[PDB]
């Protein structure tokens, strides 16, 4: 399995209002994916984090979710 | 904060000649502007120490330059002091 950035277009890392793109950086649980899966730069990663959290406060993205199967 | 035009006004005011940026006059001027700003900031926010250190360092630099000016050309030193109204 490849990474998130690997399959994606040209997208703003600073857009907190864009759900369609951001969601893909989260797991089944609302947790933020590590760099191993996101494949970003540490800089990219930080900006992603901040942005995600912004989206969360706006209710656009989940703070957490529940794990299926198991 | 201090924006570009704010800075430039002072630079133009204190420059010995046109184009002059880094002369002792101008340095002490800008420095003293930052000083005043920081002091007004430390009127409130008395709990901010990390900035107060910066203030100390700035003050020190200013006193260094002034001591230099007074050493070389006492007249210009008197002029600066008179203008800025410090020390």
């Amino acid at each position: 399995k490849a990474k998130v950035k690997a399959t994606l277009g040209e997208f703003d890392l600073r857009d907190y209002r864009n759900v369609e793109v951001l969601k893909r950086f989260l797991s089944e649980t609302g947790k933020i994916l590590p760099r191993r899966r996101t494949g970003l730069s540490a800089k990219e990663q930080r900006i992603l984090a901040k942005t995600i959290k912004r989206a969360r406060i706006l209710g656009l993205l989940p703070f957490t979710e529940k794990l299926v199967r198991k | 904060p201090i924006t570009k035009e704010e800075k430039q006004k002072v630079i133009q005011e204190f420059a010995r000649f046109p184009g002059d940026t880094g002369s002792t006059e101008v340095q002490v001027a800008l420095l003293t502007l930052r000083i005043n700003r920081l002091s007004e900031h430390l009127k409130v926010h008395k709990k901010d120490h990390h900035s107060h250190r910066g203030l100390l360092m700035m003050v020190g630099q200013r006193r260094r330059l002034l001591r230099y000016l007074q050493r070389e050309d006492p007249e210009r030193y008197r002029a600066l002091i008179e203008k800025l109204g410090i020390r």
């Binding site: 950035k5 277009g9 890392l13 600073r14 406060i57 706006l58 209710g59 656009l60 | -």
Partner: protein, 101 residues
């Protein structure tokens, strides 16, 4: 003055007159604090990822503005007073850092 973005999330169930009243108060508030309105995006009804004020959904507005800095926080404080306004987030506008470009 600097460049900001005001995100407003209000109650989904407002009808025409109500919503228009709220947007009226918003506009008035913006003008009062001296915010020039450059552009605006109203996304309206969207499905929240978690319930906000017991509501599963929300009404979304976005305002790109230029306004005096010292008046920002107050301008936020004034907006949250409305019961019908659930969320207000003001953010300094920033350049679009890109990736995978």
């Amino acid at each position: 003055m600097r460049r900001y973005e005001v995100n407003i999330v209000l109650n989904p169930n407002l009808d025409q007159s109500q919503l228009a009243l709220e947007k009226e108060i918003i506009q008035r508030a913006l003008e009062n604090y001296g915010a020039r309105v450059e552009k605006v995006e109203e996304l309206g009804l969207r499905r929240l990822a978690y319930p906000i004020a017991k509501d599963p959904q929300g009404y979304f507005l976005w305002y790109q503005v230029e306004m005096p800095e010292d008046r920002v926080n107050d301008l936020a404080r004034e907006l949250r007073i409305r019961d019908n306004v659930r969320r207000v987030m003001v953010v300094k506008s920033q350049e679009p850092f890109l990736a995978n470009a």
